[PDB]
Amino acid sequence: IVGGYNCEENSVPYQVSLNSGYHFCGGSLINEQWVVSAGHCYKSRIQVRLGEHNIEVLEGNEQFINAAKIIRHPQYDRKTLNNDIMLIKLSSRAVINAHVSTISLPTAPPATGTKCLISGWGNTASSGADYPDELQCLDAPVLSQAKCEASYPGKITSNMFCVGFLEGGKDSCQGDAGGPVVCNGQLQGVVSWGDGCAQKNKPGVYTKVYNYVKWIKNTIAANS
Amino acid sequence: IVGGYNCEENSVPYQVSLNSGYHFCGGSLINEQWVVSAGHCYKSRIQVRLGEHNIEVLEGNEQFINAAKIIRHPQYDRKTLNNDIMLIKLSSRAVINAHVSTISLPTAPPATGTKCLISGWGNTASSGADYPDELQCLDAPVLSQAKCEASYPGKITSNMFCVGFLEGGKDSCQGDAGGPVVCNGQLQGVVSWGDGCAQKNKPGVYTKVYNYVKWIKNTIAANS
Amino acid sequence: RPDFCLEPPYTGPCKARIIRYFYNAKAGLCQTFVYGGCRAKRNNFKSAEDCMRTCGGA
Amino acid sequence: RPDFCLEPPYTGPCKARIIRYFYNAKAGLCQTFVYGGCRAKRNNFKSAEDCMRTCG
Ligand SMILES: [Ca+2]
Ligand SMILES: [Ca+2]
Secondary structure (H helix, E strand, O other), X not given: OEOOEEHHHOOOOOEEEEEOOOEEEEEEEEEOOEEEEOHHHOOOOOEEEEOOXXXXXXXXXXXXXXXXXXXXXXXXXXXXXXXXXXXXXXXXXXXXXXXXXOOEOOOOOOOOOOEEEEEEOOOOOOOOOOOOOEOEEEEEEEOOHHHHHHHOOOOOXXXXXXXXXXXOOOEOOOXXXXXXXXXXXXXXXXXXXXXOOOEOOEOEEEEEHHHHHHHHHHHHHHOO | OEOOEEXXXXXXXXXXEEEOOOEEEEEEEXXXXXXEEOHHHOOOOOEEEEOOOEOOOOOOOOEEEEEEXXXXXXXXXXXXXXXXXXXXXXXXXXXXXXXXXXXXXXXXXXXXXXXXXXXXXXXXXXXXXXXXOEOEEEEEEEOOHHHHHHHOOOOOOOOEEEEOOXXXXXXXXXXXXXXXXXXXXXXXEEEEEOXXXXXXXXXXXXXXXXXXXXXXXXXXXXXX | OOHHHHOOOOXXXXXXXXXXXXXXXXXXXXXXXXXXXXXXXXXXXXXXXXHHHHHOOO | OOHHHHOOXXXXXXXXXXXXXEEOHHHOOEEEEEEOOOOOOOOOEOOXXXXXXXXX
């Protein structure tokens, strides 16, 4: 997260870190045994780390739970990045408390101008490397489809939307993918891609979770 | 730098000292052969000192390279301080290593609330004089255009911005001009001017490097 | 060694932080870099061993 | 000697550390001060010698 702030002043209990010997992507706890993330975060085995603030220090609220099932969207496209979403079934149920809890699925699509909270352990620099130990947060608004399309002509599918600032300066970045965009207590977006990070006229592109609610519910039911 | 701290050794490897017989301004290394500084730091002969931590003693990692070309912005105004920027071409290429390396140009203009690192060998006292041997650092946020204009009515052009604290106490000061303001890992500002240092409702004013990206790239290409 | 070994590493537009290896030809070694998760070029290896076998003559 | 010469020294708003001279009250001597690089007032000299002359 470039241009954000330390989440220690906020409650972000649905944020998870996906670990393969190190943090490589975020995710969102949507059920006691299921996480939503990005399809480009797929690995054949993933350890989900819940209850984290500082990913380098044991603080005492962590749960580390390995994936039992990892299900990339079947129509994920590795060139166009369409259908950039994945579900992870935990091998055991997360214990729900103040530090680890679920985020509601969206009941209606992203709304232009709504302020949303984006979070993650991604790069905090637009050039070079500045990766944080502590979870970062950014408040950013949903942008209109016209602005999203003008920023990325021909590259925005119906399953994508932009959140951020056309002036640049604040954005999600490498290490944030898979993590949450939450608007009014609902998970609206999965951090996906962009042209770099925090560049003028290049806001981040996010997967529209609302377009996948039936896929998510069906997948959970079929794997329970 | 008033209200700052001793920079960790090697943490600001793009910082240079401009020397005319003594340290008089800072600068930023943007390419193996080019330094950005302020236009009011112009002198006809300048020795660029790279790899410095303590400017009073040789510590072994210094490179001293004379300016070959010194190109102040052609629209520099010595009364209003508009276009307060200059490029220096080094007489030989800096050796890039752990102590000396470049800072990226900005890919967005300054964003309110983002965190910046300001550095230099300027005065550390808000009144009177206390000049340091060791490079000083200061963490400070970009301020809104409205706050900048309120702090300096009728004096802030679109090529200026403010970083710091309306409450004073922490600021850049004499001896810091020309040096870097780095935000999100990119060179957002050049230390320029202010009414005193660290005074209430008088944050420092900085040259907005983003507005000079085309000029910098064109000037480099024209002089290579 | 393949000519793709001489190309600079490519992070791409996706926003993961996956640690991959690339061959740094002058340094004669494989180095780590951040891969974003999509649109990989060929100088991008999941391990140092894969990188050295392909570009380092192992 | 010119009048401005009783005027104190003016650093100005710019942030250089440029060592200049200013002619000194009743010391009958020029002293150094820090000039910031812009908006100089007249008691501001690039050398002790033209300070002494303009103000001796
Ligand atoms: Ca921890
Ligand atoms: Ca030294």
